[PDB]
Every structure is written in C-alpha cells, then in structure tokens.
C-alpha cells in the first residue's frame, strides 16, 4: 500500500541551564528507525530498528553530521523566535519541526511536507505545491520571506521529491521483513457484568501493523458512535499496535450488537458477535 518517511524534531530551551534540549527521531510508516538526543552520551545518530544497523560508517557519520547541524539551527531559532515575539529570556519555549514524504502503492511520489511549530501552535508550513508557505502570523511572514527565495525553494523541492523518496524506497527494500509486512489484527471479545442489568462488551484488536484501523460497534446494524468507548491506538512495544472499543449493553441484548474491524491485513472486514 502507501508509505511515508518522516523526521520529527523537538527543541526545548531551558534558560540558566545552558543549551536547549534537542531530540530527533525518524520513522518509516509506523516504525521508528533512528534517534538523536543532545543530552545522551554518544552525540551520534543511533539505530532504533535492526534493519538500519546494516548501514555502514559513512551513513552513520553523515547522519550524525547533519543532525548536529539541525541541532545548531534550532538553537539559533529559539533565540530568533524570542526576538520575534518579544519574549523574556527566562521562560522555556518549544520548537517542533516535521518533514518528509509520501509515496503511493507504486512507490512513486505523492506528497512532500515541511512544517514548523512554536510553543505548540502552527508557525509555518509548506503547501502541497512545494513552493508556497502558509505563515500563521506576522513573525512567520518574516520567515516566509527568507524561505521563499529562489535557491532555498529548489533545494527543499529536490530533497522532498528526490532524496526523501529514494531513501524511503531503499529503507523499504532493506527492511522488507519489517516494513513491507502487514499484520492482521488478532481479535476477540470480552463480556463483564457492571450490574445485574448491564454488561460491558469490549472488542479487542491486537498485534496489528500498520497502526491504521477502524473498530466500530453496531446495534441492529446501526452505528453506536456516541455510545462507544474507543481508546486511542497504542503501541504494544514490539512494533505492533492495539486498540479496543467497548459498549455497555443492557442484559439480554448481547446478540443485537456487532463489532466491525477494518485493517489492510484483513482481506474482508470482520464482523464479530457475542454469542
């Protein structure tokens, strides 16, 4: 199916306590593969998936060089943004940046993105055409004017359409057993009495990959969206994901209820019933 590569960067200032903390992480789809943490001992980009450990020293040296340069640009940025917004030197602030690319089923370029936030709010974001920027205020319009200039525009375009796509495909190939897999959810249902007149039915999806899934309850074929407790999809920690959906059912009505599961690993969506 479709795939993406994304890098996520977080920089947090801590005034009086020296240098801003900087964290970088890289994902292919829902699988983390690299990290850097400025507070760690190594000062290196480090592998976080077995399939990227195969990359040689030139890869690790070059990624380490670049991620430290990223780190430095963010350190500068925190100061610039404090200047832009007339903020005091004493408060802690956060910048976040995400960039990357999507490919479709044919592994051809679909979309490129580059987005930036200050203190949890949209600051500037690259539009889908890859030339124009959405600036969220006046300060961001100042940045927009810097990032709009001829040479800088082409360079980001050459990364997002070219390099990001090439490297995504290389990773997909090199990490095939992990990245090109589809793990169908293992599903079951539990029933617990909450009183003598009501019970909870909970529909479980476990051990699935990728994270995208739909779990829904119906009563007599009617969606119970407003009465379903649906938890956020959550990592099991072994590279797979979990989700559940629960309904409270009056006693005797269990057979009216159906749980419906859609996932790319399932050739047909599943319908499950307590019976």
């Amino acid at each position: 199916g479709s795939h993406s590569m994304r890098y996520f960067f977080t920089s947090v200032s801590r005034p009086g306590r020296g240098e801003p903390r900087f964290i970088a992480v890289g994902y292919v789809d829902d699988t983390q593969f690299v990290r850097f943490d400025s507070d760690a001992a190594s000062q290196r980009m480090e592998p976080r998936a077995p399939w990227i450990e195969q990359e040689g020293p030139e890869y690790w040296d070059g990624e380490t060089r670049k991620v430290k340069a990223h780190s430095q640009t963010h350190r500068v940025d925190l100061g610039t943004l404090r200047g832009y917004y007339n903020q005091s030197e004493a408060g802690s602030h956060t910048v976040q940046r995400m960039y990357g690319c999507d490919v479709g089923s044919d592994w051809r370029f679909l979309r490129g993105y580059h987005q930036y936030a200050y203190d949890g709010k949209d600051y500037i974001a690259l539009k889908e055409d890859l030339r124009s920027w959405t600036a969220a205020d006046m300060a961001a319009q100042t940045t927009k004017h810097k990032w709009e200039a001829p040479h800088v525009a082409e360079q980001l375009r050459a990364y997002l359409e070219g390099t990001c796509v090439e490297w995504l495909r290389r990773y997909l190939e090199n990490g095939k057993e992990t990245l090109q897999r589809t793990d169908a959810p293992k599903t079951h249902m539990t029933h617990h009495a909450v009183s003598d007149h009501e019970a909870t039915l909970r529909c479980w999806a476990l051990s699935f990959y990728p994270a995208e899934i739909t779990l829904t309850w119906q009563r007599d074929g009617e969606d119970q969206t407003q009465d379903t407790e649906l938890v956020e999809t959550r990592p099991a920690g072994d590279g797979t994901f979990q989700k559940w959906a629960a309904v409270v059912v009056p006693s005797g009505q269990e057979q009216r209820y159906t749980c419906h599961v859609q996932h790319e690993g399932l050739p047909k969506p599943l319908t499950l019933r307590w019976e």
Binding site: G26, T73, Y99, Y123, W147, L156, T163
Partner: peptide, 9 residues
C-alpha cells in the same frame, strides 16, 4: 536520510 541544508527561521 536527513535533509542536509536547513535554513534559520
């Protein structure tokens, strides 16, 4: 692979 050519805000 990271992008190698970042610009300041």
């Amino acid at each position: 692979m990271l992008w190698g050519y970042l610009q300041y805000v």
